[PDB]
């Protein structure tokens, strides 16, 4: 038990505990913390417990172990697909809605199970584990990994050694993401991971209740990083045993399926105390077994699941907007803000699918350029309740001048956002078609290209609607609404 690692974690916690330094210097703070992370990583052995064989050699163990406990192991087989890695390949014809998967909870790994595990003494006193379910679940996975006589050890056997999450990025692969909004989320993720690792290694070394855990003998950055990455990439929500609350869970034999566009088809059957997944679509013989991971943007996909999906219709680019404190309509508009549920300032999303804008957006904008004379109509009158109800109705403009001003401001901000980026869309497409980059650089550059494409489409939509309203100005329509 070397003492140098303790000082390294202490220094790391001290540095990362400070608030965000600001713009421009976030990069320098990132490289500083990455330097400390790298030095400690090469100061440790990495994976505390390593399986002698390869990942693909343990799948039959999963089949036998699950079959003994009533988890379906028929109708599919394990194959390493080149484009998404390991997955499930159907051994027969599966029709839509067909139920080919069910796993009893006994098999499932849950925060409650961790509370019933040897981690319970630590869970009792430490608040941090109490707050986030994923963190406690990750520590449960780590504790079970070092125990050869673990009921879930066959599950742990097949988990991949390394993933494609941002924590696996090198300085160049994060450099390719510079000037984009997602980099700030990468910053927050990496800083949180570092602070958690430092605090947790020091508590485990000092907390007496951790004496009996298998982690005390070896708690490296690689182990914690792998655990957090796995829980973050293959986690699903299930209710507590009593049914009072829901909690995070890792579902073996289900989360190993890849993602495709569609509708959620995974649900847990509390009455049977098991999780059942219905077929997302018709998977013929030899076709891959797909499921829907949720309605998350490609930015979240890259940050958490660890890959980028093409043709994703549910993508979005956070946009920071707000009303400056120097407008003469602040006091009168705050009444709507309070009554419209719209905060003073918050992060909004532009949607790739039509309509590009979102109700909460149409609302903030309608309140960002509207004139004063029209700012009391929604406050007084029998139509005030109807006006606030329809305040998000695109088909109901409050006024045509507010519309043209809104679309003007939208084009202005979108053009500013396009200018802000370091590179151009043409260069990105040429790099994708010409160069041969690694997978991680590949998804990073694809993410940047997708953000630029969504912004360009937003500019186009704003311009068409602005032209539409200008022609509507040349026209006469009696219905204001």
């Amino acid at each position: 038990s070397p003492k140098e690692i303790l000082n390294l974690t202490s220094e790391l916690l001290q540095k990362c505990s400070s608030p965000a330094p600001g713009p421009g210097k976030e990069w320098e703070e990132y490289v500083q913390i990455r330097t400390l992370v790298e030095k400690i990583r090469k100061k440790q052995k990495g994976l505390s417990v390593t399986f002698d064989g390869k990942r693909e050699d343990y799948f039959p163990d999963l089949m036998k172990w699950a079959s003994e406990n009533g988890a379906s192991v028929e109708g599919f087989e394990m194959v390493n697909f080149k484009e998404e890695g390991f997955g499930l390949r159907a051994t027969r014809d599966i029709k839509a809605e067909e139920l080919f998967l069910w796993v009893p909870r006994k098999l499932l790994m849950t925060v409650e199970s961790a509370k019933n595990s040897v981690l319970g003494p630590l869970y009792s006193q430490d608040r941090i584990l109490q707050a986030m379910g994923n963190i406690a679940l990750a520590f449960h996975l780590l504790c079970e990994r070092a125990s050869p006589n673990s009921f879930w050890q066959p599950y742990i056997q097949t988990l991949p050694s390394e993933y494609d999450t941002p924590l696996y990025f090198e300085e160049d692969e994060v450099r390719y993401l510079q000037s984009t909004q997602a980099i700030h989320d990468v910053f927050s993720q990496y800083k949180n991971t570092a602070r958690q690792y430092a605090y947790f290694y020091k508590v485990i070394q000092t907390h007496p209740h951790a004496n009996k855990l298998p982690l005390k003998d070896s708690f490296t950055y690689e182990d914690y990083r792998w655990a957090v990455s796995s829980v973050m990439t293959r986690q699903n929500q299930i209710p507590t045993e009593d049914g009072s609350r829901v909690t995070l869970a890792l579902i073996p034999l289900w989360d190993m399926c890849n993602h495709t566009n569609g509708l959620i088809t995974t649900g847990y059957n509390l009455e049977d105390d098991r999780c059942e997944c219905v077929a997302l679509q018709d998977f013929r013989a030899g076709e891959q077994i797909y499921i829907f991971y949720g309605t998350r943007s490609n930015a979240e996909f890259v940050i958490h699941s660890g890959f980028f999906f093409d043709n994703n219709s549910h993508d979005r680019v956070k946009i920071k907007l707000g009303v400056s404190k120097s407008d003469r309509l602040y006091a009168m508009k705050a009444e709507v803000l309070a009554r419209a549920g719209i905060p003073t300032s918050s992060v909004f999303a532009l949607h790739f699918t039509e309509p590009p804008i979102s109700a909460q957006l149409l609302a903030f904008l309608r309140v960002f350029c509207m004139t004063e004379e029209e700012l009391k109509e929604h406050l007084l009158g029998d139509s005030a309740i109807d006006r606030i109800f329809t305040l998000g109705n695109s088909e109901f403009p409050v006024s045509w001048d507010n519309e043209v001003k809104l679309w003007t401001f939208l084009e202005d901000r979108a053009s500013l956002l396009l200018k802000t980026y370091k590179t151009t869309i043409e260069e990105d497409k040429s790099v994708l078609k010409n160069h041969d980059l690694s997978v991680r650089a590949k998804m990073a550059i694809k993410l940047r290209l997708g953000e630029k494409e969504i912004l360009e489409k937003a500019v186009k939509s704003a311009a068409v609607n602005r032209e539409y309203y200008r022609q509507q100005m040349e026209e006469k329509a009696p219905l204001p609404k």
Binding site: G133, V246, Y268, G341, A359, F389, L391, G392
Partner: protein, 141 residues
Amino acid sequence: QSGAIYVGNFRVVNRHLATHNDWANLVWEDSSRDLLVSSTTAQGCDTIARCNCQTGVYYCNSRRKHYPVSFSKPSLIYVEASEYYPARYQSHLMLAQGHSEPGDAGGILRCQHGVVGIVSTGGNGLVGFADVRDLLWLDEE
């Protein structure tokens, strides 16, 4: 899964499927929300979540299961006329994709911190949850 929230000395359930006994013990109601609040003699075992999760789990009564779903923030959405409520303004309606057919109303959608709202509307592959976090008065006395 009785189709209603039991907390404190109160009962929260959809207005359109409530019984006359609820109105006999009416303390507050709202037609625009399809939310009915009635007083209960017993003490409920459910806690109201005062957090802002946009992802939870809801019970699809038609399937006798519960599904995880990602829902939009509380906002006012047009609701098409049905056999029970004619099309009118409906506030505090969380909208998300899911299975919701007639009679599904009453399923509780649950996140980490507790109850957020209740399934109120369905159709066209869309599911509407009515918020209950706003009314802070709904707590122990």
